[PDB]
């Protein structure tokens, strides 16, 4: 839809702090902090696929809106994830060990804007079309 396409990371703010708040260790934060992923989003019927491709690590999720699924995150958390569409925004929550983080993806002008919240830390990652 509005989200479908191949997107390339152009900016990131507070990603190291966001990863620290998740409990991510130094080596993995060093890898993630300097990654400039592509995000490839596609839809086939009820199923949406989001691939994140980067030099040192790829991940992929496929999901139906409002249906919880198991996810292994890039930092190796085993989480229960639910993604919904709310006022044009894809809202993802990941739940594990009584904690949660939210990842919201929204389209603004030319950009795909990704807001990641963990406790008091808010990170903003912006992608543009490849
Ligand atoms: C939590 C955590 C630890 S590490 C890591 C992570 C990447 N996270 C992303 O891109 C993320 C988003 C996005 O912008 O799509 C939005 C959601 C949040 C997370 S990308 C990438 C790594 C490490 C390995 C790598 F090879 F460096 C490449 N996420």
Curated annotation (Swiss-Prot):
Per the annotation, the residue ranges of the short sequence motif Nuclear localization signal are 20-30
Alphabetically sorted, this entry's keywords are:
Acetylation, Cytoplasm, Lipid-binding, Nucleus, Phosphoprotein, Transport
Q: Which subcellular locations apply to this protein? A: Cytoplasm; Nucleus
What is said about the domains?
Forms a beta-barrel structure that accommodates hydrophobic ligands in its interior.
Could you tell me what this protein is called?
Answer: Fatty acid-binding protein, adipocyte
What SUPFAM superfamilies does this protein's entry cite?
Answer: Lipocalins
- Gene transcribed to yield this protein: FABP4
KW Zinc (keyword) present: no
Q: What is the lineage of its organism?
A: Eukaryota, Metazoa, Chordata, Craniata, Vertebrata
Q: Please give the subunit comment from the record.
A: Monomer. Homodimer. Interacts with PPARG.
Where is this protein chiefly located?
A: cytoplasm
Could you tell me which residues carry Phosphoserine?
11
Q: Which GO terms describe its molecular function?
A: fatty acid binding; hormone receptor binding; long-chain fatty acid binding; long-chain fatty acid transmembrane transporter activity
* Disulfide bonds, paired cysteine numbers: none
GO CC list = cytoplasm; cytosol; extracellular exosome; lipid droplet; nucleus
Name the source organism. Answer: Homo sapiens (Human)
Q: What positions are modified (Phosphotyrosine)?
A: 18
